[PDB]
Amino acid sequence: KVQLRESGPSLIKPSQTLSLTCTTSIFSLIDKTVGWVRQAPGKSLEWLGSIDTSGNTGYNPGLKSRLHITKDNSRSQVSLSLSSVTTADSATYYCTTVHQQTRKGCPDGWRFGWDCGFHGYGQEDCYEDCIDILSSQTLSPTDAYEFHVDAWGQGLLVTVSSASTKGPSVFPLAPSSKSTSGGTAALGCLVKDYFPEPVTVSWNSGALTSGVHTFPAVLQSSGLYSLSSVVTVPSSSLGTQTYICNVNHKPSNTKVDKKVEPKSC
Amino acid sequence: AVLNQPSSVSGSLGQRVSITCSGSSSNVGNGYVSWYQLIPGSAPRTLIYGDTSRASGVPDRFSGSRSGNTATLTISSLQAEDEADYFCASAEDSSSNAVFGSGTTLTVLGQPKAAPSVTLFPPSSEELQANKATLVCLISDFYPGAVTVAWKADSSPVKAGVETTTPSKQSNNKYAASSYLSLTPEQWKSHRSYSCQVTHEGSTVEKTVAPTEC
């Protein structure tokens, strides 16, 4: 599946300038406008800005002072910047293709002459009364602003913090004799003591998806995160089928593949 | 600015609900409202644009309307997978000044209840040899998505060292959660057993592990 891909630090210290980039030209950067949307924990979506094939830039008024958006149709990269970040700026940052354009419209309850069914001079104007059109109140059309997000990236989680990056320690959650459920058995991997979020987990390089659940992380009093990923598998396979959890911690540029071996009882 | 939405709406399975998006003439009244669906763990998905037009892949039971400064997203034949956060959006004085609503969390009532399956993992041999110990209680396939977890050492309630996640949806739309008890290897080996007790809808399932086993 083709995507828009965000890139940038997962961890940034307060006040620094968050620098991100979006890179994808299959969604023709020459024929599509790209925008940036963020969502902080427990808050609603928030517009940041956009830029089209030309370089025409529009910004969230409340944030335009700290926002700067450029592009490079050469490298096919739109790049956003956000200065003087704070903990309020920790959020998921989404790259998106966006539909923007101003179109001529009529006030609510009015219709264009041609929409009323009138053909002739004056058909491009707005009319309050489509039935008795020759005596209808009439207006020249006004600008109607059109916006919607067309394509969404997967998003990049950015954490604003003074704490330091830490890669995970991965331990097996092995199935045992008393811990099965008849035909099936639960096994998993414990992903311990990492910072910042996020961690993703797959099994057997993506070949195993049936029965997989990766839990959200817990935040410990230590300030570090831990999570678990579990898969329910056939009990009769334990021993013959190899199970490997693939842990990705992009904030530390770490990947771990951990074989989960069954217990000998 | 922020468009006004109800924080929470409840619809019954197989029935219909409407999510309201109230704005002003400079945004909603400009006549091009869009809607977005956000399921935890996934990226947002565009549902509606231009007040009434469905995006690619949006079933017919999702419909959008508008009357003046108020827009409405109506969802009929509610399914469990419709539970999500829904946001409206509109330009304001410029097709590049977008404003989103405050968001609505949709709950689908009348879903079938399910008691949780619990698996309690003892500390791995590898973790113990690294001089740490974590008991891991995984709780899955339950509904509604609310549980309370208590831990015991032998028969003593254990308070400190417990971390528990808020339940979240699995791929099959049932809920899962996890609880952790951090111990020293010495505490693990000193006690005769440890237990995780999961309470769900007035009933409790307890799983126990002992260091004298595998």
Residue numbers in the entry:
A (entry chain H): 1 to 82, 82A, 82B, 82C, 83 to 262
B (entry chain L): 2 to 9, 11 to 27, 27A, 27B, 28 to 95, 95A, 95B, 96 to 106, ...
What's the publication's text?
The cow antibody repertoire contains a unique subset (~10%) of antibodies possessing ultralong CDRH3s, which can reach lengths between 50 to 70 amino acids. The unique CDRH3 structure can be separated into two microdomains where the antigen-binding disulfide-bound “knob” sits on top of a long b-ribbon “stalk” and can bind to both surface and receded epitopes. Ultimately, we isolated a total of 8 and 11 cross-clade nAbs from cow-485 and cow-488, respectively, all of which had ultralong CDRH3s, suggesting only ultralong antibodies were responsible for cross-clade neutralization detected in sera. BnAbs from cow-485 were named Bess, while bnAbs from cow-488 were named ElsE and assigned numbers based on their order of discovery.
